[PDB]
Enzyme design. Structure first.
Site, mmCIF file in Angstrom:
data_model
loop_
_atom_site.group_PDB
_atom_site.id
_atom_site.type_symbol
_atom_site.label_atom_id
_atom_site.label_comp_id
_atom_site.label_asym_id
_atom_site.label_seq_id
_atom_site.Cartn_x
_atom_site.Cartn_y
_atom_site.Cartn_z
ATOM 1 N N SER A 160 77.958 -1.465 53.298
ATOM 2 C CA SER A 160 77.744 0.193 52.092
ATOM 3 C C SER A 160 78.696 0.656 52.437
ATOM 4 O O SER A 160 80.310 0.782 52.387
ATOM 5 C CB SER A 160 76.680 0.369 52.311
ATOM 6 O OG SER A 160 76.571 1.923 51.579
ATOM 7 N N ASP A 213 72.771 -1.796 46.725
ATOM 8 C CA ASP A 213 73.697 -1.793 47.682
ATOM 9 C C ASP A 213 73.665 -3.052 48.164
ATOM 10 O O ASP A 213 72.607 -4.010 47.410
ATOM 11 C CB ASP A 213 73.389 -1.160 48.562
ATOM 12 C CG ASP A 213 73.462 -1.147 49.864
ATOM 13 O OD1 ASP A 213 74.936 -1.440 50.044
ATOM 14 O OD2 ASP A 213 73.738 0.269 50.386
#
Lengths: 618, 618
Positions: free
Chosen positions: A350, A483
C-alpha cells in the site's frame, strides 16, 4: 448650546442623525456626506472616500472643485483613508491622472499596500495592485510583503504574491531576509513554500529560515521547512548549525527532528563548539541522546547481469511508510549504493506500493520521505473516508499522468491490489516485466458462469499506484480495486510465489538463463505498535487487525520457508512505543517515530553491517 | 312421546338433561351411569368404565349384581371400553380378582394395549404395562408396539420402550421387523433410533430398514437412517441393495443420497443386474448420471518408522466439513489404508480442527460424517449467535470430558486458534508432540512489555477443539480464543512452517533422526462457491471474505513453495454449485454438495490415484 444649533440649521440651508454631530466641529462641505478642513485633522474628500459612498465621490470631485491628493494634518492621504472602510471602488476612481498618493505615505511610513496588509482588507490590495502600487516601496519593518506577514494576514499576503511573483525575491532591509525568514506561522510557511520558494536563500549574517524557526522555538516551521527541502547543518551566523540552536533550548523534539533529517553532531561552529559538547553541557538527556553516526570499498556489486537475485518487500501501512524509508535510507547510506541499483526485485502493498513504484522510477529516498510528509496534509483531510482526489491526483503529478507502467523495468517491480470486481475477490499483481503464463490450472474460469473478466495488462503508473496504496478501511470504494492489504499487506510471502512462478514460466519456455536463487529477501515493515493486553467496536474490528497484520505469522512462514530454500530472510522493522495509526498527520509524533526507527537501527547496527555485507558480495 | 317420559319418571323412582338423554334405548341399570344389555351393542358396566365414574364402579360390582368380564355386542371387553375414555384407574380397580381381560382381545384382534396404542392414550398404555399386560399378543398389524407405530403414536411407543427395552427387539410376526421396518414416520425413526435401535435388523427376506424406506419412497426416513449409521449396499431380499430399490423409481434425490453415503454401482443382485444397468434401462437421466464404465497388490507400504513424512492439512470451514470428510473417505477407500494410519502429520483449523482431532483418536471417517449430520441440528438452533452449550457439550461427549490432549501422538496433530488475549492477536497451535523450541528469537516480548498472560501447556482435547472450531462471526466470545479462520484458516502454510520449526529443533537438539523432508502435503478444502461477479453491508463484509479466504493465494503460495522444496502439493476440493453457508442444517443441500464432491472425484480419477500411489510408494 442654542447658538450652535442655530448655526447648524443656518448651514443646513446651504431627527436624531446629525444631532450626534454634537456628541465636535464639522462644516457644510465636510458633514455634507453624513477642499475645506476640520479641527480634528480631517478632510471632506477623505470622509466621502471612507464611508463607501461612491456616487457621492463622483459628485465631490467630478462636480465640485475638490483636489484629490489631499493630505490631512494627521499624515494620511486620500487613497488609504478608504481601505479603513469597505468601498474598494473609491480606490478605482482615485487611481487617475493628477493624483499621486499611491507612494505618498506617512502614517508611520505604511503605504496603502501596508495598511491593507495590517487590517486584512485583501480585495483592497488587489485593487491597488492592478494600479501599479509599487511593492518596491521600502517601509518601516520592510517591504509591503513583509508587512503582511508581520501580522499574519493570510488572504492579503496570498493576494500580493499571486499578483506579483517577483515578491518571492524581496529582502527585509534590516536583515537581508526572505519573506519566510522573518515571518513565521505554521500555515504561512506552507502557503509561501508551495509557491516555489527557495529555503536556502540565506540572510544578512547568513541565517536560514529554519534557524529562525528554531531560535524562536516554533517546531511547526522547523518541520514545514525540513519537509520542503530545508538542509540542516547550515553554518549560519556563528557557524551555529541549526543543531547548536536547538540544544541551546530544551527542545528534544526539535533536536531529534533535525538529527533524523541529517544534521551531524560533531560539526563545530566558528568557535569550535561541537553540538555534542553543547549536549553534555546542558543535560544528561541529550548526551545519552546523541551517539548517532572499516573496509568500505563495496567489493563486487553494481547493476549488472550475474548470478543471484535480491528481493525487497515493502509492506503496506499508513503514513507510517516513512519508517521503511528511514530504514531503507540507513541501508542505502550504509552501503552508499542507492537502493534502486541494489535490488533486482521489489514488491510493495500500500504505502510500500507508492514507495517501491517510486524507487523504480529513479526517485531518491530522502526525496520520498519529503513526498510523504508533503502528501499526508493534502490527503488525510476527511472525517473517516477520503474522496481520493488528493491521493489520486497527487500521484498523477508525482509519477506522471501519462507515464505507463512498463516504461522502466530497471528492477522488476510488483504492486499488490485486491481486485474487488468479483465475489471471489482475487489478487492482481501490478507487474512491469511481462507476466508469468503458467501453468494450466484455471480454477474459476473455463467452466460456465462467468467470463466477463478484465485484467488490464500493464499501463498507467499512477492508476496502479492508487489501486495499490489506499488502505481502504480508511479511504473509500476506489474503483475496481481496494488495498492489497485486504489480502496480502505484506508481499514478502506472496512475492516469492511470484518469483518462482515467473521462473517456471521462463524455464518452461526453454529460456533457462533465469536469474537463479533469491539469494537475499529483505522485508521492511512500517513499525510495530506495542503489545497491549485485551481482557475482553473492538470485537468486530479485530477481523481487520488480523486481516492486515503483517508482523504475526507472515514473518514465521516466510522465514522458515527461506530457511527451506537457502534465502536468509531479513525482516526489518522497529518496535515503536506508540499506537501510531495509519492516517496520522501530527508530524510531531511522526518525527518521534522516525527517531524510534533510528534508535532501532542503532541498537542493531550489526545486522545492517551483515546485510550490506551480503548485498555487495560476489 | 308421553310413554317414553312415563318410563323415564317410573325409572326416576326405580335433572334437566334426561329428555335429551332419551334421544336408542337405555335402561334403569344402564342409564344409571349417564346388569342389562343394549339394542345398540352396549352394556351398563362398560359405560361405568367409560364415563370415568370410579365410585359408581365400586357400587356396580360390590353392591349391585354385575359380573366384571362382560363382552359387548361388537367384540370389545370391559377393559378396552375404558381406554376409549381417560380414566386409567378404573383399569386398576378392574385389575383385580376374577378379571382376566388383559389378553381379552377382539375388535378384530385388539388387545387393551393395541387400542390404547392406536388412539394415543399413552397413560393408558403405561397403566396396562405396569399391570403385566402381556405384549406377546399378535394384533392386526403385528405386536402391540407395531400397532402403536402403524399409526405413529410417539407417546405410546416411547412408553412401551420405557417399560421394556426388549420391545426394540421384537419382530413383526407377519414379516419380522424391528419397530423400524413396518412403521414409518420421519421423526419416529429418530425417537426409536436414538433409543439404541439396531439397523442390522433383517426382515423375513433379509431387508434392512432403509430397504423399507426406499421401496416405499419416503426420502425423509432414508436420510434419517443413513444419518444414524445405516449402511447402503446391504444386499437384502433379492441381493437388491437399497440402490437397486431407488432406480426402479425416478427419484434422483434418493439415488444421489445413496451413492453419496457409499452405495456401489457395480453391485449385482441375485439375478446379475448391475444397478447402472438398471439406470440405462430406466432413463437417460440415470444412464448419464451413474456409471463408472489394475495394480492393486499393495506393493511395499505400511505406517512404520522409515524415510519420508506425510502431511495432511484440513482447512477450517462451516458445517461444510463433510466435504473434506467425503474427500478423505474417497481417498481412504481408494487406498484402503485408514486415514489415521496413512498420514504422519495432520493440521486442522475450524471444522477440520474437530475432524483432525477425531481421526487422531482413531474415530473412523464414516463415523464423523454421521456425527456432523447428528450435531448440525443440535448446535445451530439460534438466529445468528449460538451460546455453544451444544457444541461445547457435544465435544465433551464425543472426545471425553477428561481426555487430555497428548494421550495419543499417534500421528502428530495441530489445531489452529486465534489467541485474542492480546492486542497483537497472535496465533497459538494446539499441539500434541511436545513443542518446537524456536531459534531463540522472541521478538514481541523482551522489552518487558507484559508477563501476566499465560501460554497454556498441552491439555484438554475438547476445550481446544472448541477454542479452534468456533467461528466467532457466528458463535460468541469463546474464552481466550476465536476461530482459526481469523488467522491461518488453511494451516498448510503455517503447518509447514511448524514442520520445519520442529525438524530444526530436533536437529538443533542433536537428535539427527529427522523424520524427513515431508514428501507430500495434501490440503483438503471445504469446497469452492461459484464465481459471482460484483458490479458494486456488502463492502463491509467483503473484508471478512478476504480475511478468511483459504482457496485464494494460500493455495498458490504453498504450491510454489513446495515446488521449491520438492513436495507435490495436492490441493483437493470441489466447485460446488452454490454458496453453502456456514450454519447450514438442511441436509438435502448438504447431500447435494456431497454429490458435487463425488462428481469432482469422478472427473479427478487421475489426481486421486496418483496421490494414493505416492502415499504407498518407496
Amino acid at each position: 448650546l442654542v447658538n450652535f444649533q442655530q448655526f447648524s440649521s443656518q448651514l443646513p440651508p446651504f431627527v436624531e442623525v446629525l444631532q450626534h454631530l454634537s456628541d465636535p466641529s464639522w462644516t457644510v462641505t465636510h458633514l455634507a456626506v453624513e477642499s475645506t478642513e476640520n479641527e480634528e485633522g480631517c478632510t471632506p474628500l477623505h470622509l466621502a472616500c471612507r464611508k463607501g459612498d461612491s456616487e457621492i465621490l463622483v459628485e465631490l470631485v467630478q462636480y465640485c472643485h475638490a483636489q484629490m491628493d489631499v493630505t490631512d494634518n494627521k499624515g494620511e492621504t486620500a487613497f488609504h483613508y478608504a481601505v479603513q472602510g469597505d468601498n474598494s471602488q473609491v480606490l478605482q476612481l482615485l487611481g487617475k491622472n493628477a493624483s499621486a498618493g499611491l507612494n505618498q505615505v506617512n502614517k508611520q511610513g505604511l503605504t496603502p499596500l501596508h495598511l491593507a496588509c495590517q487590517m486584512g482588507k485583501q480585495e483592497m490590495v488587489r485593487v491597488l495592485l492592478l494600479c501599479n502600487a509599487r511593492c518596491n516601496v521600502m517601509g518601516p519593518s520592510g517591504f509591503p510583503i513583509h508587512t503582511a506577514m508581520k501580522f499574519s494576514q493570510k488572504g492579503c499576503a496570498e493576494m500580493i504574491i499571486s499578483m506579483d511573483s517577483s515578491q518571492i525575491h524581496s529582502k527585509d532591509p534590516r536583515y537581508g531576509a526572505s519573506p519566510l525568514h522573518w515571518a513565521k506561522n505554521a500555515e504561512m510557511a506552507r502557503m509561501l513554500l508551495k509557491r516555489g520558494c527557495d529555503v536556502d536563500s540565506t540572510s544578512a549574517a547568513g541565517n536560514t529560515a529554519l534557524h529562525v524557526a528554531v531560535m524562536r522555538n516554533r517546531f511547526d516551521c522547523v518541520m514545514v521547512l525540513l519537509t520542503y527541502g530545508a538542509n540542516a547543518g547550515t553554518p549560519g551566523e556563528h557557524g551555529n548549525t541549526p543543531l547548536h540552536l536547538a540544544i541551546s533550548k530544551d527542545n528534544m523534539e526539535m533536536i531529534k527532528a533535525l538529527i533524523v533529517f541529517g544534521a551531524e553532531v560533531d560539526t563545530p561552529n566558528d568557535f569550535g563548539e561541537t553540538p555534542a559538547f553543547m549536549a553534555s553541557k546542558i543535560s544528561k538527556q541529550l548526551q545519552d541522546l546523541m551517539p548517532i553516526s572499516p573496509a568500505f570499498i563495496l567489493s563486487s556489486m553494481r547493476d549488472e547481469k550475474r548470478i543471484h537475485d535480491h528481493l525487497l518487500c515493502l509492506d503496506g501501512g499508513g503514513v507510517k511508510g516513512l519508517v521503511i524509508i528511514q530504514l531503507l535510507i540507513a541501508i542505502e547510506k550504509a552501503s552508499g549504493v542507492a537502493t534502486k541499483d541494489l535490488f533486482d526485485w521489489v514488491a510493495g502493498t500500500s504505502t510500500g506500493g507508492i514507495l517501491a513504484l517510486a524507487i523504480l522510477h529513479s526517485k531518491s529516498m530522502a526525496y520520498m520521505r519529503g513526498v510523504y510528509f508533503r502528501m499526508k496534509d493534502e490527503v488525510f483531510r476527511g472525517s473517516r473516508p477520503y474522496e481520493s482526489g488528493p491521493l489520486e491526483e497527487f500521484l498523477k503529478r508525482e509519477f506522471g499522468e501519462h507515464t505507463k507502467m512498463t516504461d522502466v523495468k530497471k528492477p522488476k517491480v510488483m504492486l499488490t491490489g485486491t481486485l474487488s470486481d468479483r465475489q471471489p475477490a482475487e489478487l492482481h499483481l501490478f507487474r512491469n516485466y511481462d507476466a508469468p503464463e503458467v501453468i494450466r490450472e484455471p480454477r474459476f474460469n473455463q467452466n460456465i458462469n462467468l467470463k466477463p473478466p478484465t485484467q488490464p495488462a500493464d499501463q498507467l503508473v499512477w492508476r496502479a499506484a492508487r489501486s495499490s496504496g489506499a488502505a481502504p478501511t480508511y479511504f473509500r470504494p476506489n474503483g475496481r480495486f481496494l488495498d492489497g492489504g485486504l489480502l496480502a499487506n505484506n508481499p514478502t510471502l506472496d512475492a516469492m510465489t511470484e518469483i518462482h512462478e515467473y521462473n517456471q514460466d521462463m524455464i518452461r519456455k526453454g529460456q533457462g538463463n533465469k536469474v537463479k536463487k533469491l539469494s537475499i529477501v529483505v522485508s521492511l515493515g512500517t513499525g510495530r505498535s506495542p503489545q497491549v493486553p485485551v481482557t475482553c467496536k473492538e470485537l468486530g474490528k479485530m477481523v481487520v487487525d488480523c486481516c492486515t497484520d503483517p508482523d504475526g505469522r507472515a514473518v514465521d512462514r516466510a522465514r522458515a520457508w527461506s530457511e527451506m530454500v537457502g534465502i536468509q530472510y531479513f525482516r526489518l522493522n522497529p518496535q515503536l512505543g506508540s499506537d501510531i495509526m495509519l492516517d496520522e498527520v501530527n508530524d510531531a509524533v511522526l518525527v518521534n517515530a522516525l527517531w524510534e526507527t533510528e534508535v532501532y537501527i542503532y541498537e542493531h547496527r550489526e545486522e545492517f553491517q551483515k546485510l550490506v555485507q551480503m548485498l555487495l558480495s560476489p
